[PDB]
């Protein structure tokens, strides 16, 4: 037991030192090379209403413009974001949900909270009614965070500090992925599906495969439970926000963080992150009633979104950038454009 | 401006908000409680009496009891970290939380079971979001006790207790013990009950203390309180 | 999913028929019916149609006033009362389902409908019998008094396919998306008023009557209907 706990003592050392070897310059120093961002001015365009719940998951669609909310009162609602009409109100049997995902197809959504069991409603089916499709159960803890790898596989994320790759055909889960101290919070998939980031409460991120389904990298640095993790858009880096009131930038071929965003004023936790298209600003849900830009190549704050009466909890950019949709525990979503 | 499409998509949308309001004053009517202790609290046994009046995951009982509806849920079997989903609970009604009183001289694997479930106690009471939620303590081991005490001092557990060794002077130290554990008195209530084999009286008492929050509810909403 | 219609055979002019259509295997609250009657050798027309929760009900002139339609939600069926009867209503009733969203597929499913018997946006298509041999393309044009493109950004345009013995057939719904089920050799294009259903390869389930269909408001027109026989 001694010779391994050294050994893994001498490891951890060695990735250190050469984390910080590969540390040649900052990227403050090479982002102060060109002019900053102006003032971002978003004015809410659609005021969406109809929710009587604490909002805690939102997911846009590849078309841009549905979006699939889900809230405490076990209705999952799809908002069209240019006529803010309903298009369909899947009743959830357990009410207390607390993820949400919308396939790429839009065919199929899934579910999940405190009920352990991920659930799976099908929008296209023959008989008019959204009704569940598959039932994922074996998880011992409640869903934190669900995410669509393809029409036929998904990817959940457990509070039993171990996620697992669930095919929806079989039903089986064929992939378990193992190694996290904390429960994982959220998860975030690469643009191309072969690698995803996860977060967990042990305040580090892992990086895993689909295929392999092994930890192919650890990130460190955060001093509190990790609540949101996104995905670069150019799927090289990935960014999390923790309970320390602070955002880090991660790189995957870095191994170390790049630039970290925090303010004096700022004391309260994170609860979601998102990037634009181009990744040129980022944007982090706070508990202080309203969101905060920052400028992900100077930290700089490019704007604050407020107007919610209540913690925010998710947030999620267009696919083509055109508008960003916010929604928090006063039962309003507001999309900003 | 709007097509046939359009109105209709509009007219589909205003009844599926109508619907969903109708459903949201439906669900209002029912109370919400969150039932919490030791799993050798005696939770199964108030559970299985409240069912018979009327896997992994959370439990939700329904009963009705004089015109009003519950909703217990009880989160024992979710071992893991509560205070990251506690929250979800803010606007729950009560909290129902049972300790084994006769458990005092036992070992488990703080190492007594009596300072573990005051810490709980203590943390479910001063959290964040329960601040104005009211809690029900309720002993359902005080048979065992009684039982227990005639043999094995209570000295054991709290050596600073210098009181009679009666049941009566005992329980009404423990009462004392966990009410002082109440930082927010001005805010929040505690009603404490000794549950025993009949279970009419607790779903009354429980009855009592769901009116007694609703009326406190109702008076802080409207402007009064 | 299922239609089956009822009422009708021979009925004098003074007399008064209530069809009955009894709907099952899908959500009928949500999903509004339309009836398209269909006289011999005759093209398609729109008769009436309820809105969901019977909040919004609609009549083509030539039957605004004289008939009734009711919609029973509860019961999952449907009314329509005919109390006068002309000499030129004589036609084959059909239902049809129709649900508005965004992404829907309405006027999917066709029933069988029932034969009755007694004792505006123009559409045209260019040419009505066009015959082909199997395996070769085909093309059948369409054209519209009213330019279909509506501000928003989409053309309202259908087109059905009725085979001998058959009820009308989706083939693909506002000029842009293929209907569920059908194969994917039909292709829909257009452009204001000129339109075009191409079928890259005839094949013989694909023998019958095409039908055009304009959605940009209430009085609904359907056009000749280009037949196709080997």
């Known amino acids: 037991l001694d010779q391994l706990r050294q050994e893994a003592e001498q490891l951890k050392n060695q990735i250190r030192d050469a984390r910080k070897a590969c540390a040649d310059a900052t990227l403050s120093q090479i982002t102060n090379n060109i002019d900053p961002v102006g003032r971002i001015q978003m004015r809410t365009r659609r005021t969406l209403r109809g929710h009587l719940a604490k909002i805690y998951a939102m997911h846009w669609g590849t078309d841009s413009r549905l979006l699939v909310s889900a809230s405490q009162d076990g209705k999952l609602i799809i908002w069209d974001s240019y006529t803010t009409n309903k298009v369909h109100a899947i009743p959830l049997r357990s009410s207390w949900v607390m993820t949400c995902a919308y396939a790429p197809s839009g065919n199929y959504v899934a579910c999940g909270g405190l009920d352990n069991i991920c659930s799976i409603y099908n929008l296209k089916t023959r008989e008019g009614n959204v009704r569940v499709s598959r039932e994922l159960a074996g998880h011992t803890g409640y869903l934190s965070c669900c995410r669509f790898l393809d029409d036929n596989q998904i990817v959940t994320s457990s509070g039993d500090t171990t996620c697992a790759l669930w095919d929806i055909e079989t039903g089986q889960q064929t992939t378990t992925f193992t190694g996290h101290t904390g429960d994982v919070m959220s998860l975030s998939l690469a643009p191309d599906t072969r690698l995803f980031v996860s977060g967990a409460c042990d305040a580090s991120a892992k990086l895993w495969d689909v295929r392999e389904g092994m930890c192919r990298q650890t990130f460190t640095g955060h001093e509190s439970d990790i609540n949101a993790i996104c995905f670069f858009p150019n799927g090289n880096a990935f960014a999390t926000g923790s309970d320390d009131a602070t955002c880090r930038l991660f790189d995957l071929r870095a191994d170390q963080e790049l630039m970290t965003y925090s303010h004096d004023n700022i004391i309260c936790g994170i609860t979601s992150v998102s990037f634009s298209k181009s990744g040129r600003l980022l944007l982090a849900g706070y508990d202080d009633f309203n969101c905060n830009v920052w400028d992900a190549l100077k930290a700089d704050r490019a704007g604050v979104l407020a107007g919610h009466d209540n913690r925010v909890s998710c947030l999620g950019v267009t696919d083509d950038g055109m508008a960003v949709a916010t929604g928090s525990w006063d039962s309003f979503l507001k999309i900003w454009n | 401006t709007l097509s046939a499409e359009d109105k209709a998509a509009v007219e589909r949308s205003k009844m599926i908000d109508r619907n969903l309001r109708e459903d949201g004053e439906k669900a209002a009517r029912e109370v919400k409680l969150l039932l919490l202790g030791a799993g050798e609290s005696g939770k199964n046994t108030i559970v299985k009496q409240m069912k018979i009046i009327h896997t992994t995951g959370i439990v939700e009982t329904h009963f009705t009891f004089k015109d009003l509806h519950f909703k217990m849920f009880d989160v024992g079997a979710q071992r893991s970290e509560r205070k990251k989903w506690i929250h979800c609970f803010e606007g729950v009604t009560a909290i129902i939380f049972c300790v084994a009183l006769s458990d005092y001289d036992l070992v488990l694997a703080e190492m007594n079971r009596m300072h573990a479930s005051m810490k709980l106690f203590d943390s479910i009471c001063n959290n964040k979001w329960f601040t104005d939620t009211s809690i029900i303590l309720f002993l359902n081991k005080k048979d065992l006790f009684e039982e227990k005490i005639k043999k094995s001092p209570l000295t054991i557990c709290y050596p600073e207790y210098a009181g009679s060794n009666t049941y009566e002077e005992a329980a009404a130290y423990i009462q004392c013990q966990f009410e002082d554990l109440n930082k927010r008195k001005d805010t929040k209530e505690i009603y404490t009950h000794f549950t025993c084999s009949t279970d009419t009286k607790n779903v009354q008492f429980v009855f009592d203390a769901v009116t007694d929050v609703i009326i406190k509810n109702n008076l802080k909403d409207c402007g009064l309180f | 999913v299922q239609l089956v219609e009822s009422g009708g055979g021979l009925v004098q002019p003074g007399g008064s028929r209530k069809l009955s259509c009894s709907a099952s295997?899908?959500?009928?609250?949500?999903?509004?019916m339309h009836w398209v009657r269909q006289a011999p050798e005759k093209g398609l027309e729109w008769v009436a149609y309820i809105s969901s929760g019977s909040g919004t009900i609609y009549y083509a002139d030539t039957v605004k006033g004289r008939f009734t339609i009711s919609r029973d939600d509860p019961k999952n069926t449907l009314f329509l009362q005919m109390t006068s009867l002309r000499s030129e209503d004589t036609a084959m009733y059909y239902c049809?389902?129709?649900?508005?969203?965004?992404?829907?597929?309405?006027?999917?499913?066709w029933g069988q409908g029932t034969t009755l018997t007694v004792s505006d946006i123009v559409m045209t298509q260019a040419t009505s019998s066009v015959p082909v041999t199997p395996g070769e393309s085909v093309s059948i044009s369409c054209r519209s008094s009213?330019?279909?493109?509506?501000?928003?950004?989409?053309?309202?345009l259908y087109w059905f396919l009725q085979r001998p013995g058959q009820s009308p057939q989706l083939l693909i719904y506002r000029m842009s998306n293929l209907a569920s089920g059908v194969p994917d050799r039909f292709s829909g294009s257009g452009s204001g008023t000129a339109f075009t259903l191409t079928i890259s390869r005839l094949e013989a389930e694909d023998v019958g009557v095409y039908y055009c269909?304009?959605?940009?408001?209430?009085?609904?027109?359907f056009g000749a209907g280009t037949k196709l026989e080997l």
């Open positions: 269909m304009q959605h940009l408001e209430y009085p609904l027109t």
């Open positions: 295997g899908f959500a009928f609250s949500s999903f509004g």
């Open positions: 049809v389902r129709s649900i508005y969203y965004y992404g829907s597929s309405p006027f999917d499913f």
């Open positions: 009213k330019s279909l493109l509506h501000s928003n950004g989409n053309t309202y």
